Amino acid sequence: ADWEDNMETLNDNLKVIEKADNAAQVKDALTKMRAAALDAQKATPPKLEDKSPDSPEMWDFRHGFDILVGQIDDALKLANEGKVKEAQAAAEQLKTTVNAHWQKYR
Amino acid sequence: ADWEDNMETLNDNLKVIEKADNAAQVKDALTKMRAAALDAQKATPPKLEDKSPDSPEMWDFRHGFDILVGQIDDALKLANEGKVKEAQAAAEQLKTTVNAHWQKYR
Numbered sequence: 621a622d623w624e625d626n627m628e629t630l631n632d633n634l635k636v637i638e639k640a641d642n643a644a645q646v647k648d649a650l651t652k653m654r655a656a657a658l659d660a661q662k663a664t665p666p667k668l669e670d671k672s673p674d675s676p677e678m679w680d681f682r683h684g685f686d687i688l689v690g691q692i693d694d695a696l697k698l699a700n701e702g703k704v705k706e707a708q709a710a711a712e713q714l715k716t717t718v719n720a721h722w723q724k725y726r
Numbered sequence: 727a728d729w730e731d732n733m734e735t736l737n738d739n740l741k742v743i744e745k746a747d748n749a750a751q752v753k754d755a756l757t758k759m760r761a762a763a764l765d766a767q768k769a770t771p772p773k774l775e776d777k778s779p780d781s782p783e784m785w786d787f788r789h790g791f792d793i794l795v796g797q798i799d800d801a802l803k804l805a806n807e808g809k810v811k812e813a814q815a816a817a818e819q820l821k822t823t824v825n826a827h828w829q830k831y832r
Contacts, residue, residue: 679803690792
């Protein structure tokens with residue numbers, strides 16, 4: 621539940637989704653990502669330790685993770701529709717944003 | 727806390743933000759919208775009462791409100807930066823998505 625471990629779970633489950641061959645594996649990885657993205661929004665990365673809870677920086681942080689959760693939800697939509705290849709593509713598109721957020725708040 | 731009340735809250739606070747003449751008014755209305763959107767996302771909307779909670783339609787529902795929350799976050803970012811004109815503009819962009827979600831799931 622600290623921010624780095626949640627970012628790792630996001631990062632690791634991206635690789636898992638790409639190597640995934642079946643729908644259960646993709647859905648499991650997306651479910652783990654959604655949980656990790658919501659838990660990461662409750663955590664404090666180093667660049668936010670000294671920032672007020674209503675600071676623009678905190679709101680920008682929350683924005684990034686709420687959008688990420690929204691995108692993982694849409695990937696879960698596709699997966700549950702039986703469009704698993706589309707769901708994997710949707711997830712893979714998150715890699716640069718996950719990595720960008722990882723570095724921004726490091 | 728049902729979905730209809732929360733959608734009404736999103737609707738009416740959009741007009742509050744439109745007519746606001748000070749920063750606290752916009753920030754509080756966005757705060758009320760955020761609470762309404764998150765509370766509305768925990769609910770089951772009328773259109774989906776007959777659907778599994780793991781259904782693609784429910785993930786699409788969750789995706790829409792997660793994106794909406796994400797956008798409210800960014801408007802609160804802007805308002806707390808003291809760019810209330812920009813916050814108002816960002817909030818106007820939600821009136822479209824609020825109304826579309828209300829129409830889809832009512």
